């Protein structure tokens, strides 16, 4: 499954992986610049903390950057 | 959320050799650049030697053929060989790191210090 990643926001092929993810979560600058954002693939859709949240799908580069 | 800690400073003879080592610990997602700069009393944060992710390393003119900068990534530890050193090369050496991370609103880029280590030479 090919999905895009970060930091280079560009599209990767990953092996064993089969599901695209946009990860958004709160650092210390949430208030100033805005929701830290992480673009992955996965084999499974990851599991998060409460305050994260995250967006899984499967088709090919279907987690391009809010 | 981002901790550089250092090591390897001590005192020297005129000609001897260091190795001063800055390992980077936290929130080092998108690490994108490393330096070595050096202080001494009455001067700035002068620059000694710094590497960009994919970019050649560059030096200041001062210490070119003498000290050597070199990042482990897997380790995430940026490390400065100092050979032939001399007296003007006292001072306290600091370890900058620049991380970048994306956020809703943009790609930001952010500089990061760490504690220090002192080099004398004499």
């Known amino acids: 499954i090919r999905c895009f990643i970060t930091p280079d926001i560009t599209s990767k092929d990953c092996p064993n992986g089969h599901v695209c993810y946009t990860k958004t979560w709160c650092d210390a600058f949430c208030s100033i610049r805005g929701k830290r954002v992480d673009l992955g693939c996965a084999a499974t859709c990851p599991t998060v903390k409460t305050g994260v949240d995250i967006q899984c799908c499967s088709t090919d580069n279907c987690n391009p950057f809010p | 959320q981002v901790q550089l800690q250092e090591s390897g400073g001590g005192l020297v003879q005129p000609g001897g050799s260091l190795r001063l080592s800055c390992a980077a610990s936290g929130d080092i997602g998108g690490l994108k650049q490393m330096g070595w700069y050096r202080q001494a009393p009455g001067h700035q944060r002068e620059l000694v030697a710094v590497?960009?992710?994919?970019?050649?390393?560059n030096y200041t003119e001062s210490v070119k053929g003498r000290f050597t900068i070199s990042r482990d990534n897997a380790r995430k530890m940026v490390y400065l060989q100092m050979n032939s050193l001399k007296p003007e090369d006292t001072a306290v050496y600091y370890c900058?790191?620049?991380?970048?991370?994306?956020?809703?609103?943009?790609?930001?880029?952010?500089?990061?210090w760490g504690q220090g280590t002192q080099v004398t030479v004499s």
């Open positions: 590497k960009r992710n994919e970019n050649e390393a």
């Open positions: 900058n790191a620049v991380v970048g991370n994306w956020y809703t609103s943009g790609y930001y880029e952010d500089t990061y």
